[PDB]
Design a binder for this molecule. Sequence first.
Ligand SMILES: [Zn+2]
Ligand SMILES: [Zn+2]
Ligand SMILES: [Zn+2]
Ligand SMILES: [Zn+2]
Lengths: 193, 194, 144, 149, 277, 277, 353, 353
Amino acid sequence: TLETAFMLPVQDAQHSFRRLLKAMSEPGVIVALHQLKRGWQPLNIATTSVLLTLADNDTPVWLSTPLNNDIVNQSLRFHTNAPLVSQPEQATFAVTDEAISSEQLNALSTGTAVAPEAGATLILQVASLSGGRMLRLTGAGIAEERMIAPRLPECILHELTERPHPFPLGIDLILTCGERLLAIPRTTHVEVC
Amino acid sequence: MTLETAFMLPVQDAQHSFRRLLKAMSEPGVIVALHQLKRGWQPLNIATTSVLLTLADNDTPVWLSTPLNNDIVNQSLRFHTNAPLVSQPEQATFAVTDEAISSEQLNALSTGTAVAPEAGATLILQVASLSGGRMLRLTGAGIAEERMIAPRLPECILHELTERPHPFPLGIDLILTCGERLLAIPRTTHVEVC
Amino acid sequence: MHADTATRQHWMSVLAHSQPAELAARLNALNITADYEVIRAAETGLVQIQARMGGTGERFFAGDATLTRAAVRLTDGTLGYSWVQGRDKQHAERCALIDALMQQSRHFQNLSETLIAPLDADRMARIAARQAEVNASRVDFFTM
Amino acid sequence: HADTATRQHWMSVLAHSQPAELAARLNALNITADYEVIRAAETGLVQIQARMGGTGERFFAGDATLTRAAVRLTDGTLGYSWVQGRDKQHAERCALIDALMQQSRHFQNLSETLIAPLDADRMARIAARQAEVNASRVDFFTMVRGDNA
Amino acid sequence: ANLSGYNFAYLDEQTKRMIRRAILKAVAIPGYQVPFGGREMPMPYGWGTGGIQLTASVIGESDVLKVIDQGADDTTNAVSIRNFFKRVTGVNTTERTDDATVIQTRHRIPETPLTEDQIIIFQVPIPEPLRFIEPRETETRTMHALEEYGVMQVKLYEDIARFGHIATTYAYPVKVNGRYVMDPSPIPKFDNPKMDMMPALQLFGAGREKRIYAVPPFTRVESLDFDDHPFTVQQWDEPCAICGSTHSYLDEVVLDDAGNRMFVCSDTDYCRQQSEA
Amino acid sequence: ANLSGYNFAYLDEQTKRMIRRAILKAVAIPGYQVPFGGREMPMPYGWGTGGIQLTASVIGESDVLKVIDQGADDTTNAVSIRNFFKRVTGVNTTERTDDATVIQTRHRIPETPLTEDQIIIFQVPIPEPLRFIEPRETETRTMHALEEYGVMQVKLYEDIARFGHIATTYAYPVKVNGRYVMDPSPIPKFDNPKMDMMPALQLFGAGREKRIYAVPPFTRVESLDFDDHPFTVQQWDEPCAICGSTHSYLDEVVLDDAGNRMFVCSDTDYCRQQSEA
Amino acid sequence: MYVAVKGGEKAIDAAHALQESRRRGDTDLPELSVAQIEQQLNLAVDRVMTEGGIADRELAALALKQASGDNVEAIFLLRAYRTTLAKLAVSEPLDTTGMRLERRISAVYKDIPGGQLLGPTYDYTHRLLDFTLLANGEAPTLTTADSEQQPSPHVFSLLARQGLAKFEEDSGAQPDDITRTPPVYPCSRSSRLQQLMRGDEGYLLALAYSTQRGYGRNHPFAGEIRSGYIDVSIVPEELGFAVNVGELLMTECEMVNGFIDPPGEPPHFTRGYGLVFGMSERKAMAMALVDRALQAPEYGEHATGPAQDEEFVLAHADNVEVAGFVSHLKLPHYVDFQAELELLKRLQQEQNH
Amino acid sequence: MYVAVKGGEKAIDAAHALQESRRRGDTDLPELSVAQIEQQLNLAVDRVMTEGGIADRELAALALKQASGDNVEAIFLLRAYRTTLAKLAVSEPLDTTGMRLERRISAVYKDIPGGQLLGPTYDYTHRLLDFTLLANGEAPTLTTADSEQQPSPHVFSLLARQGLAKFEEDSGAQPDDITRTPPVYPCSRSSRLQQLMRGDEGYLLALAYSTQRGYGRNHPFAGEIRSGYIDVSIVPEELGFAVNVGELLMTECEMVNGFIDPPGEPPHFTRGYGLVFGMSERKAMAMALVDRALQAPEYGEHATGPAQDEEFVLAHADNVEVAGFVSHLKLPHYVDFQAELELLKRLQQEQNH
Ligand SMILES: [Zn+2]
Ligand SMILES: [Zn+2]
Ligand SMILES: [Zn+2]
Ligand SMILES: [Zn+2]
């Protein structure tokens, strides 16, 4: 028995997309993806909604082992037909929780200088979008400054503050928690307050 | 007379005349006969008139020297060929003269250019005899070994032929006519006296 | 009588622009009766088209159109001509016949009134009718 | 695989049949058969693969129209069709026959009275066309015996 | 609503999904031309298929759609595109800039400032700002990779040398977020300043050339220029003849066989609202 | 002898006249490619229209016409051309080289030597022997004007360096009357020696490329070579399978699916002669 | 042994009969009339008249029927027919200011004197296959407006009167005629335009397109496209005055191109010109764009794209030449191939692997 | 004083009505059926299927009827329709050795196994307009010969078995699909061939022609052209075995091209490949010629003509792109033109001699 997906796949994917578009284009804005009502545990509602909206046979998906079980796997295959890969370096969409390792993060595809779009998007399920270390965001999508305090593992925070890869290379980050979502593209300047 | 008559059979008589002239030009010194035309447009002879009826039209200006220029010839050429008649030799595709041709007139004839050697004049020269003149030896393209001929030629014409002042591929091609008979010497032919 | 050039140009144009079936129908209803010989049987060839660069400039050749010409002679020696676009040989001969007839006092006023003017009116009405249809596709932007 | 081959054959004969002739033949047989449409006839594309130089690497050479249908008989038998073109009623009929041909009560009968005749007709059309085309063969040489020296 | 027999917004869901992924990459890489597997539409290539595919992938049943061409809603191709979407989505439409949620445009940014959550979608013929310097994509993609944009400065000064002025008057190149040089689509240079730190999202679609790009809200957009030859915009001696505005981009409407003309607002929504007071 | 409704030999008299003038210039300037205002024929360009226009402009009621293609009278296009001329002139035709006054050919000179007052007319695709070195006529015209043919020697050398042999096997360039370099049409190398000091007139017609050229009787025609590397011709290890001749240019006929083949005379009239004798 | 037999003529006769049979198709269907083709496939006919070179709709439709709809074969049939016809006259030069308009648009101003007249067009259609055309249908009842044609000056006359463009002036130069004289590059603009009108629509469109993408750019705008009827006149020797012989439906395109700044005089736009038979526009547009490209010599422009390369463009433009020579590869070539084989076999023998 | 009014939709609707009326033409003539077009204008249909990309004769003929015979508009209508259809299967690769032959010729040998089969062809016709087609007529009653299809090996197999050419081998490489992913130069040969099949006949013919005249020479011979019916099969997941769904009439062209002398092996001919729907072969021939030209990278050849320039060829090949962008100049461009005017006027004012 598989998980169910969108009840109104056309309308619900469109709604989810517009919320994610808002988040990615105005980094640090938290949005809600309400249309799906049960997440594919341990995937939360937002994570599941993003995958149902963007993943298909053209987009390899890597689910870290804490988020990897046969019901989610079979359900993803059935509803989206996305290839499931077991290596992060092979993924178009990477999905992890807070236990992500430095080695997994660093294995993710970043794009190339000539084709910066050809890399991974990291979807990271966090314990909370508040109560973490306070950050200041600046850059494209931010009029002046935006402060956020997501619960982030140190190596993720390191990627954001140091940007080891020269722009236009880099992963874009989507933080999910429950039905809610926050995005930080590779352009955002991030500093710890 | 206002108007002369042309070929009785414009298609066939032109084809006939052309094949004779082709033989003459491709095998220099060979004398051929053209009368599928009963009489020339006087003072043009049969051979001259046949050549003009065969090759001249609105695309080929014709210059006729004074002794060969009269109203009946001109009107008849206009009516039958619609060739433009021009007053200066340098303007001509076909030049038509007799033995009185001057060095000035000869030198004015278009010779073509190195890149467009076909863009010059053909000289139709009416001679009093194709055999009473100085004996010449012909060699070159169109001749297996050698060919002797002895037309009556003006000195300046013989000079053009023996000395070839214009570098090949430039040069006039020469058509000699006498009555119904014709002899051609293209610019390729090597010509020597005796 | 001796028709001026513009008068002749007009009736020749009306004939050349006429629909061959309508000219045939009209001329048959009038009774031809006049004798004539065809001195140039209808011949179809080409008219080479000259156009102009930018509409107003140097000439250039813009292909060819079909053209049919014919010529007739009436008993009194009157010569009639036609040059009509297309390949309709009977039509061209009819046009040439009418051109000859129009030059005679016996026929000029009658045919002007009963043939040429009606043909011209019909063509003008067809042009007007088409322009009315075409003008429905005008894009309106501003008023008054 | 002869059983597979047999089914491949009747499916091919149906797919190549002229829809009018199949309809006519099937009606004249007057078969009463209850069935359910599992997949309503659907018309889309089949993507065409060709080969470089006929034998080499694959490349895509456009698409053709394709119509597919599927039916289920009362006893559970599933019939299918995939037929070039856009004729939905024809595809449904082909799916039905594919199902019936799988049943003992119909296989031999329909093989003899429906599939074999349809195939014969097609084969006769092919032969007739080859006879026409062959008139356009250019003759150059022929073998004979005898000659001098 | 959609009673057309086609999928909502005509595109199938796979095509929308692929476009949505491309939009999200474009947003994260501002000004970079993201290639996408665009498909043939019921409008010819060159007549706005990129914009159509973006709008179709973005729009939802509750959006309010505005479509303009040359600044006007009633332009032939705007009518054609807006009516297509009405047929295949049943979405509410508007001519009022401040009522729209999605604006699809060919060659104008409205005079009315855009606001948060508005999306403006530009039709783009040539997405490569370097293309009339270097016609080969094999070459220009590497120039972008290496941030080799000097040739564009050269092109500009060469105008100045030859004519005394920069000669690019529309599709005037801009630097986005301090990095990529981007073609803003064939808007007049007059509109370029509106792109800088705008509250709305800008998307750009080149259907024939198979590129999508984007400028997030509140992103620096700086037109290329020099200190001794700073950016200028179109000007006219006349105000709008209908509403009197001196602040709008004007259309030259030729009235007479001989001489007489009228200058009126290109942005026809803006013009009517000016006229109303 | 024409009963088609068309002019004798199809062409109108003005067209024949213009071609006749060009032939005479060509004869006087051996090997020079004379431009001519050729006209569209009932055969497509590329299918022998230059030869057709030449034949139509020289042929008369009493000529005996032979038409061959690949050496054979029965070849499809030879049948088409010959039947065309039968229809529009009614001339006698023949398959016997000996009996012809005019021979129109594609890609062969007959094995039977030609004689006085025969005319052979070659169909030519590319009249410019320099064309595969220099594709522009704007340049090759001047190369001929100036007798600048040195580049052809480099090309021959390069063949020899690369392959050990000259790689041109047909349409092999020749020097005519010690001056112009000429393309002999796509006859095999094998036939080139036949062109030298021939009693017959040779005409060449390139209809699509609008050139006519000629070699008068008894003119030097010499294949290009080196002082070191001499001209050679096609060879086979077999006689004609039909007539036994070892002196003819042979056709390779593939007999079956396996590797079985037969070699037979290309010149089918010559083959007939040999075998019946 | 083997003996040779005749086969060429009987194969060809059978091959043509087969083609004729295929052309007629299923005889349960009525045979198409030339009139139907002329009327209902009228845009195919426009192309065939223009490249075939004869503005006769019936002859072009006839060629199309004869060619089983193959435009290239139809064009060649019509062009070949040209050769059989006598030239009876040369027209007075056309006056496109006298056009009775079917259609008139301009891209360079919102509105213009005489207005934007869309006329019959597929522009702005949604390209959705119309399956109602599978059965008989009814054509629309056309709405009507006022019947007068408004004054419609050429847009380039408006530009030129402002001094923003230059009038095209007539020096009286006699036009070159490539149907009489073979092309020898470089050619006059009158020759180039004549050749472009005859040229392949698809090839010239692709070259024009390449200039739009930066391979020899010329910054084009559609200054005007007008379609409509123009009177044709001749001056017969028999009469010595002009006679109006009929009218031609034609389409004229004027492109505005990049401005230049000449010495002494004010800067101004340059331009291109296209003119075709019938309503089909894209050829006229391509013609105008490549016209401007090939004005490179007059403007001292360095050719950076193929569309600016005069010999390359014009030598490969006429599909009567192009299609003939590509297709001629189907002719027997075994004598030449055998010459190649003879060498290749020798080259193999001289190696050891 | 002026006030703005609406007019766009009214004008467009009237414009389309005019076009529909013109398409129907004189209603005294019967309306053409798609079936008639399909049967009797079958070569037009061949081109529209091949460039439109859907091998369905009824849809291609429908597109032609809808387009008033305009091939470019019909191609676009069919291509646009393709977008709305689901991909239901992918065929097993075609096997052209299984072709039921209509026609089979080879230029490289006088006779070959299976013979020269001219088939239905316009080859060797005298192009004289046939005025009997202006009336109803009767097709020929076809003569018949033996009904056997003789064994007809590919000529390139004969050459390869002799070591004179190399077999085209299959490494199992997955083909690229340009309809799913946008072009990235340089492209695989599988991508280039897919693009060439869809490309404009006239443009590709012109490029191929230019190579024949020395702009990127490749010494072509028509090794074989065959036309005929090929079975199409799929392997549906529901069944797991191959199902024959029908057949396609196709034309295959194999060109022999200049030989090369590789280091490790005997010298041998190179080759080109063309494949199209239906009987019209000139496109297949141009395809093969430009295929060989665009093999320049694999052979380390440098471009001596536009036909060898991969981006130039393929970027400007698809007339759905080409004709769209050339025709788009008809759209209003007055905002951009006003920007040009605003500058030009300023430049003029700054000069006043
Ligand atoms: Zn205003
Ligand atoms: Zn023999
Ligand atoms: Zn050839
Ligand atoms: Zn544009």
